[PDB]
């Protein structure tokens, strides 16, 4: 039968270990699980499998664009802030808004700003002018886990546009992740 513990009478100091799926009941009530969709939208793989805006860059020259990729404190991706460590594939969505040209895109977890000066083997995919691509950067990190908060939690993204004439433009970037491994959930964030 039902114990008084499952009827509401408990002790907060006896909750450890963390993660106790204890059932709560009372007459005329029982946990009822009803599904509306064929699958879950709470699963990490599904939720995060959907991109979210990151930032935009307006180029004028053929200079390079180096930016510390990090988890959002803004979109639905904020749900990541509930975790401390991450590891797995990273999907980067880049939109190359230009009349005539090409956009070199690369990604690395390497902090050194000189290993990027060349782009030899940092994944120089080419998005023709007015096009957009979605490259999935592997976990080529030198650290087993990525603190989820760091201003560079995610590796740096590089964008060296190869323009042809006076043409200029802007590169909007949004991103998601493929199968994410989050660990050791931390306390909920505050609001600004």
């Amino acid at each position: 039968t039902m114990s008084p513990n499952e009827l509401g009478l408990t002790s907060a100091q006896d909750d450890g270990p963390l993660g106790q799926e204890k059932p709560n009941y009372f007459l005329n009530f029982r946990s009822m699980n009803v599904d509306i969709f064929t699958v879950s939208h709470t699963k990490v793989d599904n939720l995060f499998g959907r991109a979210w805006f990151f930032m935009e860059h307006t180029f004028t020259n053929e200079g390079q664009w180096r930016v510390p990729l990090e988890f959002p404190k803004q979109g639905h991706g904020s749900l990541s802030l509930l975790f401390a460590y991450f590891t797995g594939e990273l999907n980067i969505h880049v939109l190359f808004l230009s009349e005539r040209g090409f956009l070199r895109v690369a990604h690395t977890y390497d902090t050194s700003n000189d290993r990027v000066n060349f782009l030899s083997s940092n994944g120089v995919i080419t998005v023709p002018a007015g096009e957009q691509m979605t490259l999935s950067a592997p976990y080529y990190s030198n650290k087993p886990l990525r603190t989820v908060r760091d201003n560079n939690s995610l590796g740096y993204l590089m964008c060296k546009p190869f323009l042809t004439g006076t043409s200029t433009g802007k590169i909007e970037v949004y991103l998601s992740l493929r199968c994410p491994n989050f660990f050791f959930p931390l306390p909920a964030p505050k609001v600004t």
């Binding site: 599904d35 509306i36 969709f37 064929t38 699958v39 939208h41 599904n46 939720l47 499998g49 959907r50």
Partner: protein, 239 residues
């Protein structure tokens, strides 16, 4: 081993039209991409609608009665108008007309919708005349129909598809009009369905405590063999 050839990706020729969007074929739209989080489907709930299943075929709606050219007031022209709401009066001679008009699908609320949706159709049409008299009133009324007729003029119905109505307990007589056109499919909005006439056969009788004239209602629907075919543009705007 197939190492006599350098492995390469498959090469394919792209047919006419780069991003041609087909908004005509359903087989095309149903295959469109999904903005769903995981491209899945939801579980529908009919109960909240009081139904046990969704509605799959529209033809069934076209098979639902609706008053013809319905009005607030009965025909003020002895029924010689399109109003499917007129009066059967004792005064009217044993051969005079109580209602006459050319019938079109658009004259029916339900049907008029299909008329503004589909371009063609086929099948039989059923009209049901409901005379609302008292239990004392008695008399007969013959309603005929000349298919595809266009001359709106009173004429003997001896050769027309008619139905004699003898007032009793079930005062709602019907009349079916089999598909009749020079084609296997006819315009939903074009040539009339025919001439509809309801002549008096026997003067509506009455007594001291019964009405000397009664009200009548004409409804119309599609037969069990009804069909609609091509969807076309609209000829009117609903509200």
């Amino acid at each position: 081993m197939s190492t006599k050839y350098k492995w390469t990706r498959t090469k394919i020729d792209i047919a006419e039209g780069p991003g041609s969007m087909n908004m005509a074929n359903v087989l095309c739209t149903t295959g469109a991409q999904s903005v769903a989080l995981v491209g899945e489907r939801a579980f529908y709930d009919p109960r909240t609608a009081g139904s046990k299943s969704r509605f799959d075929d529209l033809v069934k709606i076209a098979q639902l009665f609706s008053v013809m050219a319905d009005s607030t007031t009965p025909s003020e022209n002895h029924g010689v108008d399109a109003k499917g709401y007129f009066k059967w009066s004792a005064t009217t001679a044993p051969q005079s007309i109580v209602h006459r008009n050319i019938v079109y699908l658009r004259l029916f609320p339900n049907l008029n919708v299909f008329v503004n949706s589909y371009s063609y159709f086929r099948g039989s049409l059923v009209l049901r005349l409901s005379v609302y008299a008292s239990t004392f009133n008695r008399g007969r009324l013959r309603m005929g129909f000349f298919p595809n007729a266009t001359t709106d003029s009173t004429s003997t119905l001896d050769n027309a598809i008619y139905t004699i109505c003898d007032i009793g307990s079930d005062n709602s007589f019907e009349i079916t009009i089999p598909y009749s056109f020079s084609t296997w499919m006819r315009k939903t909005n074009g040539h009339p369905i025919g001439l509809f006439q309801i002549e008096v056969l026997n003067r509506l009788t009455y007594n001291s405590s019964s009405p000397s004239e009664v009200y009548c209602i004409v409804q119309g629907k599609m037969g069990q063999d009804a069909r609609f075919f091509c969807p076309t543009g609209s000829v009117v705007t609903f509200q």
